[PDB]
Amino acid sequence: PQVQFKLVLVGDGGTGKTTFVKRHLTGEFEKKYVATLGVEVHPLVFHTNRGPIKFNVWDTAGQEKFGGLRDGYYIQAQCAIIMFDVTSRVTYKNVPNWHRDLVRVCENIPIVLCGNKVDIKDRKVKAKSIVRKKNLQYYDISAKSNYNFEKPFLWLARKLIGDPNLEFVAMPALAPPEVVMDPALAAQYEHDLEVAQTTALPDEDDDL
Amino acid sequence: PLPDLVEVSSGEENEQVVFSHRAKLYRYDKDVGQWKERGIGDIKILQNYDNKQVRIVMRRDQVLKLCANHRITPDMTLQNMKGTERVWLWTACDFADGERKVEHLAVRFKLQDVADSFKKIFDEAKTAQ
Protein backbone atom coordinates (compact mmCIF):
# COMPACT_ATOMS: atom_id res chain seq x y z
CA PRO A 1 0.00 0.00 0.00
CA GLN A 2 1.32 3.40 -1.06
CA VAL A 3 1.41 6.52 1.12
CA GLN A 4 -1.12 9.12 -0.04
CA PHE A 5 -2.13 12.54 1.24
CA LYS A 6 -5.15 14.66 0.37
CA LEU A 7 -3.96 18.18 -0.48
CA VAL A 8 -6.45 21.00 -1.10
CA LEU A 9 -5.30 23.92 -3.26
CA VAL A 10 -7.17 27.19 -2.67
CA GLY A 11 -6.74 30.78 -3.76
CA ASP A 12 -8.17 33.59 -5.83
CA GLY A 13 -8.69 33.39 -9.57
CA GLY A 14 -5.68 33.83 -11.80
CA THR A 15 -3.25 33.29 -8.93
CA GLY A 16 -1.75 30.28 -10.71
CA LYS A 17 -3.07 27.22 -8.85
CA THR A 18 -3.88 25.22 -11.99
CA THR A 19 -0.81 26.51 -13.85
CA PHE A 20 1.27 25.35 -10.87
CA VAL A 21 -0.24 21.85 -10.82
CA LYS A 22 0.05 21.45 -14.59
CA ARG A 23 3.70 22.48 -14.39
CA HIS A 24 4.33 19.73 -11.85
CA LEU A 25 2.32 17.24 -13.92
CA THR A 26 3.64 17.71 -17.47
CA GLY A 27 6.34 20.37 -17.16
CA GLU A 28 4.26 22.68 -19.36
CA PHE A 29 3.53 26.35 -18.67
CA GLU A 30 -0.09 27.26 -19.38
CA LYS A 31 -0.24 30.90 -20.44
CA LYS A 32 -4.04 31.08 -20.61
CA TYR A 33 -6.36 31.57 -17.64
CA VAL A 34 -9.05 28.88 -17.94
CA ALA A 35 -11.01 29.23 -14.72
CA THR A 36 -11.40 26.01 -12.74
CA LEU A 37 -14.97 24.81 -12.26
CA GLY A 38 -15.72 23.15 -8.93
CA VAL A 39 -12.67 20.99 -8.22
CA GLU A 40 -10.23 18.86 -10.21
CA VAL A 41 -8.22 16.12 -8.51
CA HIS A 42 -4.73 15.44 -9.86
CA PRO A 43 -2.30 12.91 -8.31
CA LEU A 44 1.32 14.02 -7.92
CA VAL A 45 3.97 11.41 -7.09
CA PHE A 46 7.39 12.37 -5.73
CA HIS A 47 10.25 9.94 -5.18
CA THR A 48 11.89 10.53 -1.80
CA ASN A 49 14.77 8.90 0.02
CA ARG A 50 12.04 7.40 2.24
CA GLY A 51 10.11 5.99 -0.72
CA PRO A 52 7.54 7.44 -3.10
CA ILE A 53 4.71 9.59 -1.76
CA LYS A 54 1.60 10.61 -3.71
CA PHE A 55 -0.18 13.94 -3.30
CA ASN A 56 -3.84 13.89 -4.36
CA VAL A 57 -4.20 17.57 -5.22
CA TRP A 58 -7.76 18.91 -5.04
CA ASP A 59 -7.48 21.99 -7.28
CA THR A 60 -10.43 24.13 -6.18
CA ALA A 61 -12.08 27.07 -7.95
CA GLY A 62 -11.22 30.57 -6.81
CA GLN A 63 -14.19 32.45 -8.24
CA GLU A 64 -17.23 32.18 -5.97
CA LYS A 65 -19.65 31.53 -8.84
CA PHE A 66 -17.58 28.51 -9.93
CA GLY A 67 -16.93 27.37 -6.37
CA GLY A 68 -19.36 24.45 -6.31
CA LEU A 69 -19.13 22.86 -2.85
CA ARG A 70 -15.74 24.22 -1.77
CA ASP A 71 -15.93 23.77 2.00
CA GLY A 72 -16.95 20.17 1.30
CA TYR A 73 -13.82 19.58 -0.77
CA TYR A 74 -11.75 20.38 2.33
CA ILE A 75 -13.25 17.47 4.30
CA GLN A 76 -10.67 14.82 5.20
CA ALA A 77 -7.90 17.06 3.87
CA GLN A 78 -4.47 16.28 5.31
CA CYS A 79 -2.61 19.37 4.06
CA ALA A 80 -3.23 22.46 1.97
CA ILE A 81 -1.63 25.12 -0.20
CA ILE A 82 -2.89 28.71 -0.27
CA MET A 83 -1.71 30.71 -3.27
CA PHE A 84 -1.80 34.38 -4.23
CA ASP A 85 -0.23 36.72 -6.80
CA VAL A 86 2.50 39.02 -5.46
CA THR A 87 1.57 41.54 -8.17
CA SER A 88 -2.03 41.77 -6.85
CA ARG A 89 -2.64 42.96 -3.29
CA VAL A 90 -6.29 41.84 -3.31
CA THR A 91 -5.19 38.21 -3.71
CA TYR A 92 -3.10 38.59 -0.55
CA LYS A 93 -5.85 40.47 1.30
CA ASN A 94 -8.06 37.37 0.90
CA VAL A 95 -5.42 34.95 2.21
CA PRO A 96 -6.81 35.21 5.78
CA ASN A 97 -10.25 34.25 4.46
CA TRP A 98 -8.93 31.15 2.68
CA HIS A 99 -6.97 30.26 5.82
CA ARG A 100 -10.10 30.76 7.92
CA ASP A 101 -12.25 28.58 5.65
CA LEU A 102 -9.58 25.86 5.68
CA VAL A 103 -9.06 25.73 9.44
CA ARG A 104 -12.81 25.71 10.08
CA VAL A 105 -12.95 22.25 8.47
CA CYS A 106 -9.48 20.69 8.84
CA GLU A 107 -8.25 22.36 12.08
CA ASN A 108 -4.50 21.78 12.59
CA ILE A 109 -3.28 20.62 9.19
CA PRO A 110 0.07 21.79 7.75
CA ILE A 111 -0.52 24.62 5.27
CA VAL A 112 1.86 26.33 2.85
CA LEU A 113 1.32 29.92 1.70
CA CYS A 114 2.72 30.60 -1.77
CA GLY A 115 3.38 34.02 -3.25
CA ASN A 116 3.35 33.34 -6.99
CA LYS A 117 4.57 35.29 -10.03
CA VAL A 118 7.74 36.60 -8.39
CA ASP A 119 9.18 36.53 -11.92
CA ILE A 120 7.12 39.69 -12.54
CA LYS A 121 9.20 42.67 -11.51
CA ASP A 122 6.41 45.07 -10.46
CA ARG A 123 5.91 43.26 -7.16
CA LYS A 124 3.31 44.76 -4.83
CA VAL A 125 3.42 42.30 -1.89
CA LYS A 126 6.78 41.99 -0.14
CA ALA A 127 7.83 38.88 1.79
CA LYS A 128 8.78 41.04 4.79
CA SER A 129 5.11 41.93 5.39
CA ILE A 130 4.33 38.20 5.61
CA VAL A 131 7.16 37.19 7.95
CA ARG A 132 5.09 32.56 11.91
CA LYS A 133 3.02 29.52 12.89
CA LYS A 134 4.50 26.05 13.30
CA ASN A 135 1.94 24.66 10.83
CA LEU A 136 2.33 27.70 8.54
CA GLN A 137 5.13 28.04 6.00
CA TYR A 138 5.75 30.65 3.32
CA TYR A 139 7.58 30.39 -0.01
CA ASP A 140 8.08 32.74 -2.91
CA ILE A 141 7.41 30.70 -6.06
CA SER A 142 7.10 31.21 -9.81
CA ALA A 143 5.26 28.67 -11.95
CA LYS A 144 6.86 30.37 -14.96
CA SER A 145 10.51 30.37 -13.83
CA ASN A 146 9.95 27.28 -11.60
CA TYR A 147 11.55 29.18 -8.72
CA ASN A 148 10.99 27.22 -5.50
CA PHE A 149 8.19 25.33 -7.25
CA GLU A 150 9.16 22.11 -5.43
CA LYS A 151 9.40 23.59 -1.93
CA PRO A 152 5.67 23.46 -1.01
CA PHE A 153 5.52 19.70 -1.62
CA LEU A 154 8.92 19.07 -0.02
CA TRP A 155 7.98 20.92 3.17
CA LEU A 156 4.53 19.32 3.38
CA ALA A 157 6.12 15.90 2.81
CA ARG A 158 8.58 16.53 5.64
CA LYS A 159 5.81 17.61 8.02
CA LEU A 160 3.33 14.86 7.14
CA ILE A 161 6.00 12.17 7.46
CA GLY A 162 7.81 13.81 10.38
CA ASP A 163 11.31 13.79 8.93
CA PRO A 164 13.07 17.15 8.46
CA ASN A 165 15.78 15.45 6.36
CA LEU A 166 13.42 13.99 3.74
CA GLU A 167 14.92 14.62 0.29
CA PHE A 168 13.50 14.33 -3.19
CA VAL A 169 15.57 11.79 -5.12
CA ALA A 170 16.07 11.03 -8.79
CA MET A 171 13.34 9.00 -10.45
CA PRO A 172 14.53 5.52 -11.53
CA ALA A 173 15.11 5.36 -15.29
CA LEU A 174 14.51 1.76 -16.34
CA ALA A 175 15.94 0.57 -19.64
CA PRO A 176 13.55 1.68 -22.41
CA PRO A 177 12.48 -0.71 -25.17
CA GLU A 178 13.60 -0.06 -28.72
CA VAL A 179 10.48 0.19 -30.88
CA VAL A 180 10.70 -0.77 -34.56
CA MET A 181 8.06 0.52 -36.99
CA ASP A 182 7.28 -0.29 -40.59
CA PRO A 183 8.75 2.33 -42.96
CA ALA A 184 5.20 3.47 -43.64
CA LEU A 185 4.35 4.46 -40.06
CA ALA A 186 7.83 5.96 -39.64
CA ALA A 187 7.08 8.22 -42.61
CA GLN A 188 3.74 9.25 -41.10
CA TYR A 189 5.57 10.48 -37.99
CA GLU A 190 8.28 12.08 -40.13
CA HIS A 191 5.56 14.10 -41.85
CA ASP A 192 3.93 15.00 -38.53
CA LEU A 193 7.31 16.24 -37.27
CA GLU A 194 7.61 18.42 -40.39
CA VAL A 195 4.21 19.97 -39.66
CA ALA A 196 5.21 20.58 -36.04
CA GLN A 197 8.51 22.13 -37.18
CA THR A 198 6.51 25.03 -38.65
CA THR A 199 5.06 26.04 -35.27
CA ALA A 200 7.37 27.97 -32.97
CA LEU A 201 8.38 27.11 -29.42
CA PRO A 202 6.31 28.76 -26.67
CA ASP A 203 9.15 30.55 -24.83
CA GLU A 204 10.91 31.77 -27.98
CA ASP A 205 10.98 35.41 -26.82
CA ASP A 206 11.27 34.93 -23.05
CA ASP A 207 14.31 35.62 -20.87
CA LEU A 208 15.70 32.09 -21.30
CA PRO B 1 5.03 4.17 9.05
CA LEU B 2 7.51 4.53 6.18
CA PRO B 3 10.77 2.74 5.32
CA ASP B 4 13.39 4.59 7.33
CA LEU B 5 15.43 4.93 4.13
CA VAL B 6 15.18 3.77 0.53
CA GLU B 7 18.22 3.30 -1.70
CA VAL B 8 17.68 4.94 -5.09
CA SER B 9 18.78 3.08 -8.22
CA SER B 10 19.00 5.39 -11.23
CA GLY B 11 19.07 2.53 -13.73
CA GLU B 12 22.19 4.04 -15.33
CA GLU B 13 24.76 1.99 -13.41
CA ASN B 14 25.78 -0.09 -16.46
CA GLU B 15 25.97 2.87 -18.85
CA GLN B 16 28.46 5.59 -19.77
CA VAL B 17 27.54 9.27 -19.98
CA VAL B 18 28.82 10.37 -23.39
CA PHE B 19 26.91 13.68 -23.23
CA SER B 20 25.45 15.71 -20.37
CA HIS B 21 24.52 19.38 -20.28
CA ARG B 22 21.73 21.66 -19.12
CA ALA B 23 18.97 22.19 -21.67
CA LYS B 24 15.25 22.82 -22.19
CA LEU B 25 12.99 20.13 -23.65
CA TYR B 26 9.70 20.68 -25.48
CA ARG B 27 7.00 18.24 -26.57
CA TYR B 28 4.50 18.84 -29.37
CA ASP B 29 0.80 18.39 -28.59
CA LYS B 30 -1.05 17.22 -31.70
CA ASP B 31 -4.42 17.86 -30.03
CA VAL B 32 -3.89 21.64 -29.82
CA GLY B 33 -1.13 22.00 -32.42
CA GLN B 34 1.38 23.64 -30.08
CA TRP B 35 4.78 22.96 -28.61
CA LYS B 36 4.68 22.68 -24.82
CA GLU B 37 7.56 22.98 -22.39
CA ARG B 38 8.38 19.50 -21.08
CA GLY B 39 11.34 19.88 -18.73
CA ILE B 40 14.53 21.70 -17.83
CA GLY B 41 17.66 19.93 -16.63
CA ASP B 42 20.65 17.91 -17.80
CA ILE B 43 19.88 15.97 -20.97
CA LYS B 44 22.14 12.91 -21.10
CA ILE B 45 23.13 10.51 -23.87
CA LEU B 46 23.93 7.14 -22.29
CA GLN B 47 25.69 4.15 -23.85
CA ASN B 48 25.61 0.72 -22.23
CA TYR B 49 29.07 -0.81 -21.80
CA ASP B 50 28.10 -4.39 -22.64
CA ASN B 51 25.67 -4.17 -25.57
CA LYS B 52 26.71 -0.67 -26.72
CA GLN B 53 23.07 0.47 -26.89
CA VAL B 54 22.30 4.18 -26.64
CA ARG B 55 19.48 6.13 -25.02
CA ILE B 56 18.59 9.69 -24.10
CA VAL B 57 17.62 10.35 -20.47
CA MET B 58 16.57 13.64 -18.91
CA ARG B 59 15.31 14.57 -15.45
CA ARG B 60 13.78 17.87 -14.38
CA ASP B 61 15.44 20.21 -11.91
CA GLN B 62 14.14 20.30 -8.33
CA VAL B 63 11.47 17.62 -8.76
CA LEU B 64 14.06 15.25 -10.33
CA LYS B 65 11.40 13.44 -12.39
CA LEU B 66 11.99 12.05 -15.86
CA CYS B 67 10.95 14.02 -18.92
CA ALA B 68 12.75 11.79 -21.46
CA ASN B 69 13.70 8.11 -21.63
CA HIS B 70 13.95 6.61 -25.11
CA ARG B 71 16.30 4.63 -27.31
CA ILE B 72 18.35 6.15 -30.13
CA THR B 73 18.60 4.06 -33.30
CA PRO B 74 20.89 4.50 -36.33
CA ASP B 75 17.86 5.49 -38.44
CA MET B 76 16.91 8.45 -36.24
CA THR B 77 18.16 11.91 -37.17
CA LEU B 78 18.13 15.39 -35.66
CA GLN B 79 16.39 18.14 -37.64
CA ASN B 80 16.86 21.90 -37.33
CA MET B 81 13.97 24.27 -36.63
CA LYS B 82 14.14 26.62 -39.60
CA GLY B 83 13.40 29.83 -37.71
CA THR B 84 15.29 28.90 -34.54
CA GLU B 85 18.95 28.23 -33.77
CA ARG B 86 20.63 26.00 -31.18
CA VAL B 87 17.53 23.76 -31.29
CA TRP B 88 17.23 20.13 -32.42
CA LEU B 89 14.00 18.29 -33.29
CA TRP B 90 13.45 14.54 -33.48
CA THR B 91 10.79 11.87 -33.05
CA ALA B 92 11.11 9.22 -30.36
CA CYS B 93 9.22 6.46 -28.55
CA ASP B 94 9.43 7.80 -25.02
CA PHE B 95 8.83 6.06 -21.69
CA ALA B 96 9.30 8.94 -19.22
CA ASP B 97 5.66 8.48 -18.17
CA GLY B 98 6.09 4.71 -17.76
CA GLU B 99 4.28 4.11 -21.05
CA ARG B 100 5.08 4.01 -24.74
CA LYS B 101 4.28 7.43 -26.21
CA VAL B 102 5.46 8.52 -29.64
CA GLU B 103 6.58 12.11 -29.14
CA HIS B 104 7.97 14.86 -31.35
CA LEU B 105 10.66 16.47 -29.20
CA ALA B 106 12.71 19.66 -29.35
CA VAL B 107 15.78 20.52 -27.26
CA ARG B 108 17.14 24.05 -26.82
CA PHE B 109 20.71 24.87 -25.79
CA LYS B 110 22.11 28.16 -24.56
CA LEU B 111 25.37 27.86 -26.54
CA GLN B 112 26.03 26.78 -30.10
CA ASP B 113 29.06 24.60 -29.37
CA VAL B 114 26.88 22.66 -26.91
CA ALA B 115 24.26 22.19 -29.62
CA ASP B 116 26.91 21.20 -32.16
CA SER B 117 28.40 18.89 -29.53
CA PHE B 118 24.96 17.34 -28.97
CA LYS B 119 24.48 16.73 -32.70
CA LYS B 120 27.99 15.27 -32.99
CA ILE B 121 27.63 12.84 -30.08
CA PHE B 122 24.09 11.91 -31.15
CA ASP B 123 25.25 10.84 -34.61
CA GLU B 124 28.41 9.07 -33.42
CA ALA B 125 26.67 7.11 -30.68
CA LYS B 126 23.72 5.96 -32.80
CA THR B 127 26.07 4.44 -35.39
CA ALA B 128 28.43 2.95 -32.78
CA GLN B 129 25.60 0.70 -31.57
Ligand SMILES: Nc1nc2c(ncn2[C@@H]2O[C@H](COP(=O)(O)OP(=O)(O)NP(=O)(O)O)[C@@H](O)[C@H]2O)c(=O)[nH]1
Ligand atom coordinates in the same frame (compact mmCIF):
# COMPACT_ATOMS: atom_id res chain seq x y z
N1 LIG C 1 4.05 35.68 -15.13
C1 LIG C 1 3.50 34.60 -14.53
N2 LIG C 1 2.29 34.19 -14.88
C2 LIG C 1 1.87 33.11 -14.20
C3 LIG C 1 2.54 32.41 -13.22
N3 LIG C 1 1.77 31.35 -12.76
C4 LIG C 1 0.67 31.43 -13.46
N4 LIG C 1 0.67 32.47 -14.35
C5 LIG C 1 -0.38 32.85 -15.28
O1 LIG C 1 -1.45 33.37 -14.49
C6 LIG C 1 -2.70 32.73 -14.85
C7 LIG C 1 -3.07 31.74 -13.77
O2 LIG C 1 -4.16 30.94 -14.27
P1 LIG C 1 -4.72 29.66 -13.49
O3 LIG C 1 -3.59 28.89 -12.87
O4 LIG C 1 -5.61 28.99 -14.48
O5 LIG C 1 -5.56 30.31 -12.29
P2 LIG C 1 -6.05 29.61 -10.95
O6 LIG C 1 -5.07 29.99 -9.88
O7 LIG C 1 -6.17 28.16 -11.29
N5 LIG C 1 -7.53 30.25 -10.72
P3 LIG C 1 -9.00 29.54 -10.50
O8 LIG C 1 -9.17 29.26 -9.02
O9 LIG C 1 -10.00 30.48 -11.14
O10 LIG C 1 -9.10 28.27 -11.32
C8 LIG C 1 -2.45 32.17 -16.25
O11 LIG C 1 -2.66 33.18 -17.22
C9 LIG C 1 -0.97 31.75 -16.14
O12 LIG C 1 -0.31 31.76 -17.38
C10 LIG C 1 3.84 32.84 -12.83
O13 LIG C 1 4.57 32.32 -11.98
N6 LIG C 1 4.24 33.96 -13.56
Ligand SMILES: [Mg+2]
Ligand atom coordinates in the same frame (compact mmCIF):
# COMPACT_ATOMS: atom_id res chain seq x y z
MG1 LIG D 1 -7.68 26.83 -11.70
